[PDB]
Enzyme design. Sequence first.
Site, PDB file in Angstrom:
ATOM      1  N   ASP A   1      -0.086  -9.702  -4.932  1.00 18.99           N
ATOM      2  CA  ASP A   1       1.206  -9.071  -4.733  1.00 18.99           C
ATOM      3  C   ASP A   1       1.082  -7.702  -5.415  1.00 18.99           C
ATOM      4  O   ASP A   1       1.883  -7.332  -6.250  1.00 18.99           O
ATOM      5  CB  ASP A   1       2.398  -9.921  -5.194  1.00 18.99           C
TER       6      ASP A   1
ATOM      7  N   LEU B   1       0.841  -1.239   0.000  1.00 15.23           N
ATOM      8  CA  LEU B   1       0.000   0.000   0.000  1.00 15.23           C
ATOM      9  C   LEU B   1       0.862   1.270   0.000  1.00 15.23           C
ATOM     10  O   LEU B   1       0.315   2.375  -0.165  1.00 15.23           O
ATOM     11  CB  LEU B   1      -0.893   0.006   1.241  1.00 15.23           C
TER      12      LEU B   1
ATOM     13  N   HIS C   1       3.644   1.001  -9.078  1.00 12.97           N
ATOM     14  CA  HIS C   1       4.777   1.875  -9.427  1.00 12.97           C
ATOM     15  C   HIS C   1       4.270   3.045 -10.279  1.00 12.97           C
ATOM     16  O   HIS C   1       3.247   2.929 -10.971  1.00 12.97           O
ATOM     17  CB  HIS C   1       5.886   1.090 -10.144  1.00 12.97           C
TER      18      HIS C   1
ATOM     19  N   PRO D   1      10.455  -4.171 -11.420  1.00 12.38           N
ATOM     20  CA  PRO D   1       9.185  -4.284 -10.658  1.00 12.38           C
ATOM     21  C   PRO D   1       8.019  -5.008 -11.367  1.00 12.38           C
ATOM     22  O   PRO D   1       8.125  -5.379 -12.544  1.00 12.38           O
ATOM     23  CB  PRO D   1       8.817  -2.815 -10.382  1.00 12.38           C
TER      24      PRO D   1
HETATM   25 ZN   LIG Z   1       5.837  -8.411  -1.877  1.00  9.49          ZN
END
Ligand SMILES: [Zn+2]
Length: 364
Positions: free
Chosen positions: A256, A65, A260, A264
């Site tokens: 998950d 978060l 961004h 990543p």
């Molecule tokens: Zn993670």
Amino acid sequence: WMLKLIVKNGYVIDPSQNLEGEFDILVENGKIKKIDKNILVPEAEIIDAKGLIVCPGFIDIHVHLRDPGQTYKEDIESGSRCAVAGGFTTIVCMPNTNPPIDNTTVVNYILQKSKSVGLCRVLPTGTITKGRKGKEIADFYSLKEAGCVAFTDDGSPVMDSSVMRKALELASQLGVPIMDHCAEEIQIARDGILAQRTGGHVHIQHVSTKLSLEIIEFFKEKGVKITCEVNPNHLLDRLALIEGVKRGIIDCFATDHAPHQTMPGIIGLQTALPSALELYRKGIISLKKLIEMFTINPARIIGVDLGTLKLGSPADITIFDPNKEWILNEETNLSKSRNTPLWGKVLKGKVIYTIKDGKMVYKD
Ligand SMILES: [Zn+2]
């Protein structure tokens, strides 16, 4: 003062009870009062769930978060909106925040924000080592008091194997899981062996190969307390995972969610259902198992009494149309971020209502 609710004409699925059928649900005072055919009582609001599927609130045990620290990528309020639009009523946030979740002050902040925003249940995790720096063992006792449900250093540089070992000893006395990863096989086998040795529960958050799955399966039949997860968004050999799901070696789905704002990876909460429903439309899993892997399985892993519609439980309920087509774009996207290959594509399966504690927290 006017708070009975009836959810009528739906198709109810609750794997934890092995209930599946055309039932009604009566909700009184934030709790499940009755499941039964044909319910009508005075002084109650009716939700008409004809043609929809009614099941326990989804639980996602792997969410970033970005709060405190990075609240321009995402924050408790946006995350929460994302989660309920996605059918989620409990989410577990990771501790790679700034500052990190290694003291009661941050835990306390996340809970308070959480109560104010009001939408879904945010459970925090603590780090394994102070400042996630890798050297010292944090105070697992005080962090469990404060509300933390698990510990993890979330990539990472753990990799000192004595640290990982202290952690599982402590975790075991405390009845909370350690969460690892984010070379894979070596790591996973180490974790398995340390878990067996100490009797602590380790939960693996990333598995990418057939051999990784076979190792986990091995330690499971030995009765090692080890579980693992997969992100349904990823899934569309990248092909043993699909088999791993088929054969029930992978315990639950988790997005998950990783916002961004420019390894990543990807935001997830809003598309997990239409992604996972792809696996059902392909006969790969039944619908009951799909719901299982969003509900009772993740509930059991973090040891909370949720993901069921047992009489007496909290009224956490998701109601979804598995055949409704929509598109994730600026119009519908409730994240501050837009990092997902699923962007702009046609999804199939949409949440119509999310109900938390008997109160309607999202509506389509
Ligand atoms: Zn993670």
